[PDB]
């Protein structure tokens, strides 16, 4: 077991933080506040508004989708990444 973000291990595996959104494990320093990792927290803040998502860095959109186990290998334009983020939004 290691942190999905920084790759580090835990001094006590029982203290690893599981993100409620992507469900991966993270450091306390790699998560915040509904315990969420920093990226999932950042995306929730956008309220999943297309315009706000479009302003996000390509790497963040790609990484966020990867954390949610969604492939972006067939995407050629940034808008496709945004559409995938919108598609997996919880309702």
By CB under 5 A, name the binding residues for Zn ion.
3, 5-6, 19, 21-22, 27, 30, 37, 40
Of the two residues 14 and 76, which places its CB atom closer to Zn ion in the complex? Answer: 14
Q: How far is the CB of 71 from Zn ion (least distance, A)?
A: 17
Q: Is the dihedral of CA 33, 37, 39, 40 positive or negative?
A: negative
CA distance linking residue 88 with residue 20, whole number of Å: 14
What are the residue ranges of helices labelled H in 1-90? 38-45, 50-54, 58-67, 78-87
Of the two residues 37 and 84, which places its CB atom closer to Zn ion in the complex? Answer: 37
Q: How far is the CB of 11 from Zn ion (least distance, A)?
A: 12
Q: How far is the CB of 38 from Zn ion (least distance, A)?
A: 8
Longest dimension (CA), the chain: 42
């Amino acid at each position: 077991p290691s942190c999905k973000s920084c790759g580090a291990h835990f001094a006590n595996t029982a203290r690893k933080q599981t993100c409620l959104d992507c469900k991966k494990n993270f450091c306390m320093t790699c998560s915040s506040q509904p315990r969420l990792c920093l990226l999932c927290q950042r995306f929730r803040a956008t309220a999943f508004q297309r315009e706000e998502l479009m302003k996000m860095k390509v790497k963040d959109l790609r990484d966020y989708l990867s954390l949610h186990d969604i492939s972006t290998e067939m995407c050629r334009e940034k808008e496709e990444l945004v559409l995938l983020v919108l598609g997996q939004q919880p309702v």
